[PDB]
From a paper:
The bifunctional enzyme Δ1-pyrroline-5-carboxylate synthase (P5CS) is vital to the synthesis of proline and ornithine, playing an essential role in human health and agriculture. The P5CS molecule contains two domains, GK and GPR, catalyzing the first and second steps in the biosynthesis of proline from glutamate. The GK domain catalyzes glutamate phosphorylation, and the GPR domain catalyzes the NADPH-dependent reduction of γ-glutamyl phosphate (G5P) to glutamate-γ-semialdehyde (GSA).
By focus refinement of the GPR dimer in the P5CSMix filament, we determined two additional states of the GPR domain. Upon NADP(H) binding, the residue R525 interacts with the adenine moiety. Meanwhile, the entire NBD rotates approximately 15° along the cylinder axis and slides towards CD. A similar phenomenon was also observed in ALDH1L1. This transformation contributes to bringing the nicotinamide ring of the NADP(H) close to the catalytic residue C598 of CD. Next, NADPH binds to the GPR domain, triggering the conformational change into closed conformation, which brings the NADPH towards the catalytic residue C598 and facilitates the reaction.
Residue numbers in the entry: 347 to 776
């Protein structure tokens, strides 16, 4: 039903709130180890899932993204191991700590957020990550996955609950039914704390319309960008384009725009660019500047913003770095932006100039999924300007509290006739 889930979440919050790290650490340890042994189960489950998906036949890249292979499995295992290793100081670690007056202390401890309602596209590999995140931050979690991996989702939840069997708190993680339950649950506020819809434009809007006294954070858009200039190895440019647009064609952070310094169009590098783009079979487009530049050129574009989410692209030429920054800040979505150059001056210039959630010099637009940032398992990427930037790791799921204990103080003791005066020194935290 509806409020039974809410009360189970509150019970999990109360339990994990009084569960010392000794419990949850071993909990995610067993989660990993059990994900290693019984993986054949979830393997065949996701096999059936992708089989029935292909039988339905939505779209080949989507079939690739909802797929699953032992490689990602071992990667998730070692990532959760890293989390468990470095999660002993999540809830309870002090951030600030001072001493205002004589015999009066003030600190700022971390604190669980409570109940989160995460929504996310099929992406069956995420469920273990997000569940490990909740179990490691000791906050109630509700789930909702795409109907595609439904069986795989249920299997993974069987896994995480057989893991929870060692701690007894069998409620902090749950599943839900179709979006009707999601609506009626988002309605019953005063029991939820955040909503993390991992990728939905219209559904970001819908949650907003249904966000009655409840915050929202996630990512609704991901238009990345790349750039090259007169001081970059052609080979590095080629292979970076390859890595960027040919690992997960349409996951979250695949670039869909190229930018070139006009003094490199004569260098025929555009030729090899299209050569490799066609060796991978990608229908490049172009916009105003290039579409004028060439004899008659590849076909025209519509809007430099439209995300395509498949083996497509767009190429424009820019007169100068200034135009590059203007173009990025005016068309991008501050998701993840790259460059390639040898002149370190232009490098730091572009780094400090652009504003995106990620900036990269001589690297790939693919390095943004938290895991490859050594952050361990994560929930998504944040485009917004509050509470996080980029991969929302653990620390993106924790807020602060001001506990303040004294002997006998008051407000007037600091007035004109008071007997104690401020110090405002920051003692070394424990
Ligand atoms: N930035 C990128 O590179 C990139 C790439 C691919 C996808 N994405 C994001 O992922 C989305 C793709 O669609 P999706 O089906 O895969 O999203 P989803 O995570 O599967 O969410 C379920 C879908 O049901 C629909 N709906 C109506 N009411 C809903 C409710 N209360 N709760 C949940 N869903 C409700 C939503 O819109 P629909 O009916 O239209 O699905 C929603 O997309 C896109 O909107 C996009 O934001 C981003």
């Amino acid at each position: 039903p509806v409020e039974v889930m809410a009360e189970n979440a509150r019970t999990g919050s109360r339990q994990m709130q009084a569960l010392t790290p000794a419990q949850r650490a071993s909990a995610v340890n067993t989660l990993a180890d059990l994900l290693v042994s019984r993986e054949k189960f979830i393997l065949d489950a996701n096999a059936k899932d992708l089989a029935e998906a292909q039988k339905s036949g939505l779209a080949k890249p989507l079939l690739s993204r909802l797929s699953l292979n032992p490689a990602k499995l071992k990667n998730l295992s070692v990532g959760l191991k890293q989390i468990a290793e470095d999660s002993h100081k999540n809830v309870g670690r002090v951030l600030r700590r001072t001493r205002l007056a004589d015999q009066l202390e003030l600190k700022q401890v971390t604190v669980p957020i409570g109940v989160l309602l995460v929504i996310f596209e099929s992406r069956p590999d995420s469920l273990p990550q997000v569940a490990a995140l909740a179990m490691a931050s000791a906050n109630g979690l509700l789930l909702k996955g795409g109907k595609e991996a439904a069986h795989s989702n249920k299997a993974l939840m069987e896994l995480v609950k057989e893991a929870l069997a060692t701690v007894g708190a069998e409620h902090a993680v749950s599943l839900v039914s179709t979006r009707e339950e999601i609506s009626d649950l988002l309605s019953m506020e005063n029991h939820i704390d955040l909503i993390i819809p991992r990728g939905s434009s219209d559904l970001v809007r819908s949650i907003q319309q249904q966000s009655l006294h409840i915050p929202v954070l996630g990512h609704a858009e991901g238009v990345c960008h790349v750039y090259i200039d007169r001081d970059a190895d052609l080979e590095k440019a080629l292979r970076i384009a390859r890595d960027a647009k040919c690992d997960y064609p349409a996951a979250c952070n695949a670039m869909e725009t190229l930018l070139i310094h006009e003094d490199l169009m004569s260098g025929a590098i555009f030729g090899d660019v299209c050569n490799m783009l066609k060796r991978e079979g990608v229908k490049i487009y172009a916009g105003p500047r290039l579409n004028q530049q060439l004899t008659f050129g590849p076909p025209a574009a519509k809007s430099l913003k439209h995300e395509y989410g498949a083996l497509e692209c767009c190429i424009e030429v820019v007169p100068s770095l200034d135009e590059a920054i203007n173009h990025i800040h005016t068309y991008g979505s501050s998701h993840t932006d790259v460059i390639v150059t040898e002149n370190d001056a232009a490098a730091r210039q572009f780094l400090g100039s652009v504003d995106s959630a990620c900036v990269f010099h001589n690297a790939s637009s693919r390095f943004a999924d938290g895991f490859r940032f050594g952050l361990g398992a994560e929930v998504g990427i944040s485009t917004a300007r509050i509470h996080a930037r980029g991969p929302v790791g653990v620390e993106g799921l924790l807020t602060t509290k001001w506990i303040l204990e004294g002997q006998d103080h008051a407000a007037a003791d600091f007035a004109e006739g008071g007997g104690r005066t401020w110090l405002h020194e920051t003692l070394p935290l424990d």
